[PDB]
Amino acid sequence: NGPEVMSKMAGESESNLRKAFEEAEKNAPAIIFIDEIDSIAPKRDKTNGEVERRVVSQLLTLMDGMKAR
Amino acid sequence: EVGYDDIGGCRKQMAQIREMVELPLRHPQLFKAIGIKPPRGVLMYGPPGTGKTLMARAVANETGAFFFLINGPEVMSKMAGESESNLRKAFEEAEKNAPAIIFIDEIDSIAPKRDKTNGEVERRVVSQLLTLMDGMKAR
Amino acid sequence: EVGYDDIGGCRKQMAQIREMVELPLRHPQLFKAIGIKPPRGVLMYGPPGTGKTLMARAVANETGAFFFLINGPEVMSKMAGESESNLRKAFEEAEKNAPAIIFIDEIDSIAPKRDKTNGEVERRVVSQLLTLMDGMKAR
Amino acid sequence: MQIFVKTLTGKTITLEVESSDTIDNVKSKIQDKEGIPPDQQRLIFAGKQLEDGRTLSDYNIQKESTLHLVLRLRGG
Amino acid sequence: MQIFVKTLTGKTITLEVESSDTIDNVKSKIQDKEGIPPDQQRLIFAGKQLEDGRTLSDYNIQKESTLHLVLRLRGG
Amino acid sequence: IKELAVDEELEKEDGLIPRQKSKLCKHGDRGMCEYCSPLPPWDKEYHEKNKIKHISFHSYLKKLNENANKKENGSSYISPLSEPDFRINKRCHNGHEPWPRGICSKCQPSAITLQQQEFRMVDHVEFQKSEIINEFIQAWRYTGMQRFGYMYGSYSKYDNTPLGIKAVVEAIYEPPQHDEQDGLTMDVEQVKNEMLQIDRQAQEMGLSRIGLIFTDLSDAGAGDGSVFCKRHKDSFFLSSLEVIMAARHQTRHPNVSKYSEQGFFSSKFVTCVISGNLEGEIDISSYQVSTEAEALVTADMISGSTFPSMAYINDTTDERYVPEIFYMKSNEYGITVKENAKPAFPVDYLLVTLTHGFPNTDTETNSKFVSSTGFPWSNRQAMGQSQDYQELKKYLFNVASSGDFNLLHEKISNFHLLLYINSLQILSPDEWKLLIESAVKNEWEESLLKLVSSAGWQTLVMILQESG
Ligand SMILES: Nc1ncnc2c1ncn2[C@@H]1O[C@H](COP(=O)(O)OP(=O)(O)OP(=O)(O)O)[C@@H](O)[C@H]1O
Ligand SMILES: Nc1ncnc2c1ncn2[C@@H]1O[C@H](COP(=O)(O)OP(=O)(O)OP(=O)(O)O)[C@@H](O)[C@H]1O
Ligand SMILES: [Zn+2]
Ligand SMILES: [Zn+2]
């Protein structure tokens, strides 16, 4: 869920996404459905002061791999 | 793994960037009896989708050196200054293995210019990186 | 380490600092006889890349001293409030084997102004430094 | 004159005892050097336990012979 | 020939004997250097008590072979 | 490098904790969102729910493997499982090349926060028989003084604690020591020379010195009351003088690990003490020392204090630089932050606890050493059970001069009886190695008849019958 795993204190969200891709690899075939990704991935604007990092960058380094059929 | 032949189109920039990684590692005797010290930092910059991280991984696997990776938004802490302790942790781990190569992508995300923030911990994050690179007397 | 006469162009500020920190360090006399206590603090400033960190290591090596080095961003990166104990043990261990030189490098990353304060551990290390600086009046 | 009392840890204790005194004075002399009470102390002379009420002559203990010291409480 | 005369207390002493000699020469050799009379000189080989009036050919005593001696200790 | 056979089995198993579906789950039946995902074995929230106070180090090895190995490239295989050092690097990688003239912050040891260790190497110590340690307390019941011993045993898996190793002990060896009513202190030279030959026979029997025991009873009145209560909550748990003997024993016996850079880390050593419960019995307890801070500072800075709860911190003489030690305690008004600018800091904080226990008598896998447990021990010279060959006519005798093999082999499997026979070295070392392997292993009936047909066992019963 979008507004559920991003409301933590920036330390368990990167391990929940690591647990998400590891469990889907164990019981393939698998799909991964996420909703409200705008709450997880906003844009960089003039109103800086949010966290805006350490979670989407975890999703960047997790998704570019794992393509070994 | 990828190699030197894995990417084309930047053949002029490939032969330019191959001088500053092979000559300090393969044949370091050219820096002797000439007086100067071999440089350390190489700066790549451009639009996204040009293959910046692809060129970094291609030069690592083709030399067999101790490659390391430091991410931009990953090591940026707010607990007690842990970003200043994890930058020097990555430098001493790369110093323990010779030869080695580190890679810091999206370096503008880690301590940018102070035209906007100017008062946060990122002012003391970049000054940690000043004394870390200048204290690299290991030739 | 670097020598002593490896700095040119800064000869006027060298003669200002050779009588300031080198001459009263090796000579406990000619200050008690004149009735003037020597100064226990100097500040160097200017544009970057001018010889701030180079002149301090050069003036302290070939004179005979202890040369307690301490970096700017390396302190305050601790947990549970032990940067004050690392500062209290810094000044206590220096005076046990006097003469000593305590070179605080990058002091601007430790003490900002009170209108740009950040958190609570930044106030705790600027008041520890102001208290411990006054404790060196015992010559 | 000379005697050698040895414990179980391989440590020999030097002591100068008279040739015509009691065994209780030997237990009192080893009390002063360490601080062990002589009630639980016992002396083994080649597998034979020395009685504290006797002397050094009836057991035929000669000069500088190797002795043994062991501790054993009566009630304990 | 070289033999290994070992008593009950583990003390092994090298003696000398001929391959066709009787065991009484060994009993006389213990009587010389240890002073033991033959009523307490009890040698045992191969689980049998070696009689004093036999030789080494019956028990097949060879070179560099060990011997097991038993010494009697009594209070009466 | 090769680790132990028990250590490699705990590494291969993941040890995940399964969960079931719940009302809070909004996903389908063929999935898991967060509430029925597999739980990691290193989460301390599940540990304190079942009253487990430590996180079972093999699972702590897994929680650092997730930080070492990532989804990114890495290409390192660092595995940062090393002993954290408080000693001072002399070369220092800077301009303050001697420590007599110069020290900066990158080589200075930081101030010790005194944080408790969350992981223990050994998770649960177990025993073999209640008659084995009953002989150890019986040594105190005869001479009235304290004793000392070393525990030989092995290791296997533990299914109660998630990814945990349990400690099994088989026999207890006592070194020659000088007893005393207050405490005890023996020479380390004669013990180390004696323990070298016991490690020879422990290799063929499959034993290893992994533990030690020392007694502390203080009997009250020898009537209705059993012992006094010395160690409680307000008093000391472990005396600071016995921390030193526990620290040197762990450094002498390292544990091999491929993940460590030096080759050895996380020593598996137990220290058990007989002290008694609070109310009325002589129930025992065991704690082991901490690796994070105490294991390295014992080489340079541990000094004895007059208090049993605390230990004095001494001064620096030109090479022995120590940092300041801080801990939190309550003042007369409230609870305050770290106060310790004073020596004699407590050592009860640096101990991690264990769970001792004895197995059920109705069933077990094996016991492997229950012969009599009444044979006179090797170095019990304070007690009367230190006999010569007169005991061998009384103990075994090849029972009633013609023994049945079901009643003869049950007595031959004793630990101290087999260690007394080979000291005389009557048998060959090849025939002795099959003798001890027959007594400790199963299907012994075909090999016991090989022992009685040999001429070495015939000479042993013949030299015993003529002697007293
Ligand atoms: N020789 C090449 N030159 C340019 N692009 C290439 C080449 N070879 C492959 N590509 C494509 O370009 C992409 C490389 O982009 P890359 O992954 O480096 O993103 P990036 O934004 O440069 O990385 P970073 O996030 O570190 O900035 C690949 O997805 C690949 O399909
Ligand atoms: N007389 C000189 N003045 C300035 N720079 C010099 C001089 N001689 C040599 N240098 C070069 O300048 C470097 C020293 O600069 P330094 O480390 O002091 O930087 P800085 O900006 O002055 O102070 P900081 O290190 O705090 O930024 C040396 O690496 C050296 O090659
Ligand atoms: Zn779920
Ligand atoms: Zn240093």
Commentary on this structure:
The PDB classes it as structural protein. The entry lists the keywords ubiquitin, structural protein. The entry is titled "Consensus reconstruction of the eukaryotic Ribosome-associated Quality Control complex". The structure is cut from a larger assembly and holds 3 copies of chain A, 2 copies of chain D (76 residues) and 1 copy of chain F (468 residues). With 69 residues, chain A is mainly α. Chain A contains 4 helices and no strands. Chain A is elongated. With 76 residues, chain D is of the alpha+beta class. Chain D has one domain: Phosphatidylinositol 3-kinase Catalytic Subunit, Chain A, domain 1 (Ubiquitin-like (UB roll)). Helix content of chain D is 16%, strand content 30%. Chain D has 1 helix and 5 strands; from the N terminus they run ββαβββ. In chain D, β1 and β2 form a beta hairpin. The longest helix of chain D has 12 residues, at 23-34. Chain F is 27% helix and 10% strand. Chain F has a 7-stranded mixed beta sheet, with helices on both faces. At the C-F interface, β1 and α3 of C face loops of F. Bound molecules: adenosine-5'-triphosphate (2 copies) and zinc ion (ZN) (2 copies). One adenosine-5'-triphosphate is lined by residues 7-10, 48-54 of chain C.
